[model samples]
Target: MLQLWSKFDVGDWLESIHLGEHRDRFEDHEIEGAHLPALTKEDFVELGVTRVGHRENIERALRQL
Candidate 1:
């Protein structure tokens, strides 16, 4: 199963020192999991691409305005 991380959880982690403070706008409240297949939140985080600034990081969050 594709275990995805909740927006709240992702947000909290992003604010940590992991991703650093260089890019804070990357924090998305509704960002989808890194790609297809199955992966737990921990697994996804291990990849280290969930945060912005990375090569595979999300350029922007899903906007609905």
Candidate 2:
């Protein structure tokens, strides 16, 4: 079964990646246990993420997992 992204406090992980300011944006779009592996840079763009560095950072973090 897919695990809940909320269960991981991904915001904390985002902080580690220097994206703490955008944590709320991520929370607002979260679909609970939604498939994180399915997310893409396009999704981040839709989430209002304008910084390429931040988007890349998030993608890199996701890849590491």
Candidate 3:
């Protein structure tokens, strides 16, 4: 299982990312499903919502829209 931390403390990590690159970052052809573009590390850092499902939960939340 992929383990995510309860607190990543990845401040400014979003600066290393390019919103346009999210689609290419994943191998899946369904790039439209990515939620990374909707947020920044600053947002996550403030949410205090880090955990094992951090990534998945974000994705699912966006898909529900």
Candidate 4:
């Protein structure tokens, strides 16, 4: 099963990746009880993410799954 320490920890991690703008989206998408894996470039792009590097960073985190 996928695990996260806390919703805000995701924010901290997003800040590390320079994708802090997506913190709300991530909270809404995950912390709000949505069932999805950590995001991918394709996933973020479909939702208006504009940076390949940010998407790559998220993918790296997801790779832990």
lDDT winner: 2
lDDT of candidate 2 over 22-46, digit per residue (tens): 7777778873435456777787777
Ranking by lDDT: 2, 4, 1, 3
Q: How accurate is candidate 1 locally (lDDT)?
A: 0.39
lDDT value, candidate 4, whole model:
0.62
* lDDT of each residue in 1-65, candidate 4, tens digit only: 34644667766766766778888876665542123364445667665566787667667765765
| Arranged by TM-score, best first | 2, 4, 3, 1
Per-model TM values vs. the true structure = 0.29, 0.70, 0.30, 0.54
When summed lDDT is taken over every stretch of 10 residues in candidate 2, the lowest stretch is 1-10
RMSD (Å) of each candidate, 1 decimal: 11.5, 2.9, 13.3, 3.7
Stretches of candidate 2 exceeding 4 Å from the true structure: 1-4, 31-34
Q: Which segments of model 1 are wrong by more than 4 Å?
A: 18-29, 32-65
lDDT of candidates 1 onward, in order: 0.39, 0.68, 0.36, 0.62
Once superposed on the true structure, which residue ranges of model 3 sit more than 4 Å away at CA?
1-37
Choose 1 or 4, whichever is better by lDDT.
Answer: 4
